Nucleic acid binder design. Structure first.
Lengths: 276, 80, 203, 77, 67
RNA sequence: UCUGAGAGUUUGAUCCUGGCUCAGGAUUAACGCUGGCGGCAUGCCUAAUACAUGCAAGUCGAUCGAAAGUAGUAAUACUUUAGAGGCGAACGGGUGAGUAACACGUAUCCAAUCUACCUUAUAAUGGGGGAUAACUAGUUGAAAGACUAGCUAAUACCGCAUAAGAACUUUGGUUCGAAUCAAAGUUGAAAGGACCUGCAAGGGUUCGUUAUUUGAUGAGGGUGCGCCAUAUCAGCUAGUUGGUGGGGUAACGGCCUACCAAGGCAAUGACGUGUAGCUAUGCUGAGAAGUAGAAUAGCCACAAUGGGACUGAGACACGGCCCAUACUCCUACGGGAGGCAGCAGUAGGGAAUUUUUCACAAUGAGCGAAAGCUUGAUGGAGCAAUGCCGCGUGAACGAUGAAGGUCUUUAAGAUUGUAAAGUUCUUUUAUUUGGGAAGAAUGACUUUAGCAGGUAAUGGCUAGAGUUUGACUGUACCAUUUUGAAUAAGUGACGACUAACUAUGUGCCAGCAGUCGCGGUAAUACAUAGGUCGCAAGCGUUAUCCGGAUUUAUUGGGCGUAAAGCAAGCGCAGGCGGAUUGAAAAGUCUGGUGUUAAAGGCAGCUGCUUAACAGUUGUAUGCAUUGGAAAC
């Protein structure tokens, strides 16, 4: 939807520029100007119909990950990958929270060698070669009752907290809570903070840094001070209790296994056996 | 042209041969509003005689408004 | 703003009508109260003369309908001329285009006058205008640009329009003339001169 | 680049060759003057200085000064 | 870019600091510590800013709420 | 007519001095939040870091050859310029690094200056000579090209003759290290176009030739004056100081050389270090004044770096040369080519600035008689709310406050709110259609009349007519021009300073913070939602400056104890200083005179609808100078 400015026409060659003012129809040329450009665009100045001719556009198959070595280098890889994506519509590059690095894609190794040559000579990137990493889930064994524990004096009156709760892991129902105080041994306002001390840990793991999911609980016992009080003490003690529970009962990860539909005209299937 | 953009203005400036515009000048002849052409401008009528006394031939384009003024009628005696 | 979107909140906060009753029309039990929900047995804790400065500046600010950059610019414009500058300030504010055409009986209100001026419904002495900034001087004849004379709303408004002694108006040909400058007692002088000159703390 | 500059570059080179030739001609004439003093050579060098100040090659003020010094030193007689 | 290094408070809930994430320091005042004389700016950096703030809308990543 | 606003903070309370912070603006300001537009101006402050392509300078065919070509049997009508020669290319651009001064600005003497093209007017335009570009042949090569030979033209250049006037010299008349006057010893200038007329030979029109004087313009030198900081920079310097001789020099001068002599400056801050383009001016303040040296203007200075040179009036020259340094590029590896602090633009840095854009339309500069040509000068449009400024987000009626939301902690209500709905109006902007600008009649050219030296024509000077110059623009603007309220507002704060309070969560935590500082069971200070307020297409907000900050004190402060009187004295220089009467007028005041540019503000006005803006009259001290004044 832009009126683009055209500077000149030209003929690229590895030696130097070669410019000619006009060119007849059905030929090929290059244009300097035209501030923004991508493949398969249609340009109109004679006020005639616009038109598209594109019947194939390859999608990437491989995913590789590269770590950065400098922050400005990281920004430069981002910019350079954007520039190369604009140059050729064949592959896409990502920097996603699943890995937190440069997720590149392409066809073959030598194409990547040419890309690193480009970003070394021009984009000043010093790209390293590594191995990709993907996120995993993390469950854990069905452990017993756990306790959160805390004394620290925090700016004046000391901050105290005792909680005794049970986590029953199960993938049928989520976070529960039962009011199992009949006498009124605990104030109702303490019902929420302990639950909070659980929510902060519903999406991370203490052993591998991956989400601990399916965390059930129920406030069963606790202890505060008579002449002193504390509110987030419950949450901090619950976080420490989560760490303690993860310490003891051997959590286990859960890996995304993929479905691959591999094809061959029954010629290189020996590769299929000897690899799979 | 100077002044407000899209509103032309042209002061009659003094130059012998080699004074670039918007700089030193020996004398200001007057002003001009080149939007409505009627030669409506204040001039000394003697500063032009000052040029006519010692040369420094005037610019060839401001000549028409002086023709409306009639500087030849007081200039023809330059060579008699 | 030019169209603040709400006038009775502001008026009921201040308490100034147009002539005697325009900000109230018995709309929802006509009362003298604030639009807030702090009750109405009290107004606020802090009390200062700068609050009255704000009240008067907003009243003059909106009852003639100007912005604030134009406001300081026109104080400077009147600062050009010497004497008792406060009365000159007020007489120039009254001289505004919408103010005069309202005082012509040619507009139900200043907002309506600015609207009709905005869409090109005014013309005087071969001078069209789309900006409420015309300073009225003795010797100005004002016409309606009668191309849009088909409007019954303007004639109905001029049926019961307010006449001013220091100008001249006509009720049917939509024409008038600026005979003389505005007078002090003839106009609502709720804006106190001393307070206005007190606010001037720019220089 | 530039074309008239090259034309101007080669234009004054021959001019400079000729002008330095006549300048060293004046130089050897005034050197003969330096060797021993006479009226005829002084007149010849003045005649040459007339042409040389006449052209832009030699400043008129310098020629006037030098001829003044020469007449001053010859009028010792 | 100079050799000297300054300490700075972190306003906003949570943090978008990730162990050598680029920051942009700005003139500030905090009386709680000798050494903090600057502030990070939210809204234009690798930090996209944060929500839960609409009384204050400029010196943060606070957009106008989508409504 | 000009002439100064407070508030808070050490304390059980309460006073002195004193800092800090806010209420005010302003910016070449990023970036949030973003956002409709019209003009209006601006848009490397940062690496004087290096850089592709197009542009940044050409022009004369009425000065010539010379070849070539369209039409020509031929003569050639015409074309066009690679080339010589003519002018210009040093003017125009941007940068501000080094520069601490005669750089700048002012007043100045240039008894030391010069200036081609103009200015009034004068003197002449006689001839002679031979190279050479180009062209041709060859060696050397893709090119680069060089070296020989032959072919020439010209306003190119070199003699001869001729000099009005000039220089040079001698005698004779002149002024408050000099100038004019009569006579003469010496000496020197050149060219041909274009046209008319005339059989011709001549003559005339006009360019130009060569000379002269009025001028002015331009550049340069000295002079007094003012124009950063630093004592944790005490002595500093020896063509240095002086003259002579000689030389150079537009020109005076150790500018330079030879001879000797021995200083020269300095505590009244030299010399040295950081640092700076300067000034006018911008901002702030009531002023005195302080900050900065944006755009714009004038002067100086630089030009990848350091030197050296020629050119022409004029340069040590952004894109003229030579060398070296450093870098880049091409290559046939033989050898060369290149200089964005020209315009755009790139790369990097940088939070932070644009178009790898258009017309030479007007005007400026260069060439030309002219057709006119060249011009990133100039003017436009692009991007940006970057600032000042206008302008949309509608307008009249319409309610015991529509829904909701909130509180009423108790249940009318109160609230956003006549804003909603609805009646109807209208098109700033958005849409249809048509008309259609000016700036551009400037400019030469094509035709007359008179005028005039010259009559024989040709030439010009004006009064008049016609030929056109448009990127802009499809613009501005207008039109009983059409659907249509339809195309939309954010914004920080709400304890006090300064203004606007309720509720949920909140529990010295999360946090918020210009200051006071608050927050652990009722937070009006946190987030939350309502409501409330202040500004507004801007609002946040730190770097930025003054005012408040009389918060280094002439204006306009103090030192007994809050900070400070040296421990005291002998005192040089310096500042101040009894009375009288005299000259003179240095300070001083005052009246005329030259100058203090442009621009900004101030007052009056003109133009755009209105200001912003532009243009216009005065408006700016001070320096020198003539005349009074003698109180200190």
């Amino acid at each position: 939807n832009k009126k683009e400015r055209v500077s000149r026409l030209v003929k690229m060659h590895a030696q130097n520029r070669n410019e000619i003012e006009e060119i007849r129809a059905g030929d090929i040329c290059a244009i300097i100007g035209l501030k923004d450009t991508t493949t398969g665009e249609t340009l109109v100045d004679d006020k005639i119909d616009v038109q598209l001719e594109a019947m194939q556009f390859a999608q990437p198959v491989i995913s590789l990950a590269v770590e950065p070595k400098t922050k400005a280098d990281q920004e430069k890889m981002s910019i350079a990958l954007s520039k190369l994506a604009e140059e050729d519509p064949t592959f896409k590059t990502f920097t996603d929270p699943e890995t937190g690095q440069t997720i590149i894609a392409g066809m073959g190794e030598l194409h990547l060698d040419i890309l690193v040559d480009r970003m070394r000579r021009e984009f000043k990137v010093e790209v390293n070669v590594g191995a990709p990493q993907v996120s995993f889930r993390e469950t854990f064994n069905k452990e017993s009752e756990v306790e959160g524990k805390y004394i620290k004096q925090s700016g004046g009156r000391g901050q105290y907290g005792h909680v005794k709760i049970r986590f029953e892991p199960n993938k049928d129902k989520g976070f529960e809570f039962v009011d199992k105080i009949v006498g009124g041994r605990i104030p109702r306002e303490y019902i929420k903070p302990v639950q909070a001390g659980l929510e902060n840990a519903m999406a991370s793991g203490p052993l591998a840094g991956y989400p601990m999911i399916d965390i059930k609980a129920t406030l069963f016992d606790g202890s505060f001070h008579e002449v002193d009080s504390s509110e987030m003490a419950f949450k901090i003690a619950a976080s420490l209790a989560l760490k303690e529970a993860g310490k003891v009962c051997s959590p286990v990860l859960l890996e995304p296994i993929m479905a691959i539909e591999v094809t061959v005209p029954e010629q290189y299937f020996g590769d299929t056996m000897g690899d799979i | 042209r100077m002044g407000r953009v899209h509103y032309p203005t042209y002061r009659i400036v003094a130059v012998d041969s080699r004074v670039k515009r918007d700089g030193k000048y020996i004398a200001l002849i007057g002003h001009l509003n080149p939007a409505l052409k009627e030669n409506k401008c204040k001039i000394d009528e003697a500063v032009a005689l000052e040029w006519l006394n010692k040369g420094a031939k005037p610019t060839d384009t401001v000549r028409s408004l002086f023709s409306q003024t009639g500087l030849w009628k007081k200039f023809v005696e330059s060579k008699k | 703003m030019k169209y603040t979107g709400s006038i009775f909140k502001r008026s009921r906060r201040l308490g100034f009508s147009l002539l005697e009753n325009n900000k109230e029309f018995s709309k929802g039990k006509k009362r003298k109260t604030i639009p807030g929900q702090h009750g109405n047995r009290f107004r606020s804790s802090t009390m200062s003369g700068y609050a009255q400065q704000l009240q008067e500046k907003q009243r003059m600010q909106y009852m003639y309908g100007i912005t604030d950059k134009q406001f300081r610019r026109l104080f400077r414009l009147v600062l050009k001329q010497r004497g008792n500058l406060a009365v000159n300030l007020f007489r120039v504010l009254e001289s505004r285009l919408d103010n005069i055409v309202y005082r012509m009986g040619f507009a139900p209100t200043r907002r309506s006058a600015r609207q009709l001026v905005n869409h090109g419904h005014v013309l005087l002495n071969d001078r069209t205008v789309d900006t409420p900034s015309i300073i009225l001087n003795p010797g100005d004849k004002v016409r309606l640009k009668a191309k849009t004379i088909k409007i019954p709303i303007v004639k109905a408004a001029s049926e019961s329009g307010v006449v001013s002694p220091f100008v001249e108006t006509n009720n049917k040909t939509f024409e008038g003339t600026y005979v003389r400058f505005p007078e002090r007692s003839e106009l609502p002088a709720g804006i106190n001169e001393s307070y206005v000159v007190e606010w001037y703390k720019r220089l | 680049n530039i074309k008239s500059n090259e034309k101007r570059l080669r234009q004054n080179i021959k001019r400079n060759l000729n002008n330095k030739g006549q300048k060293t001609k004046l130089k050897t004439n005034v050197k003969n003057f330096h060797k021993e003093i006479n009226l005829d050579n002084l007149g010849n060098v003045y005649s040459q200085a007339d042409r040389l100040a006449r052209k832009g090659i030699i400043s008129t003020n310098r020629a006037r000064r030098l001829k003044s010094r020469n007449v001053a030193v010859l009028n010792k007689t | 870019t100079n050799g000297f290094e300054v300490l700075t408070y972190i306003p906003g809930e949570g943090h978008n600091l990730q162990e050598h994430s680029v920051t942009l320091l700005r003139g500030g005042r905090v009386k709680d510590l000798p050494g903090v004389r600057y502030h990070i700016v939210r809204g234009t950096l690798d930090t996209v800013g944060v929500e839960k703030r609409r009384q204050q809308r400029s010196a943060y990543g606070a957009k106008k709420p989508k409504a």
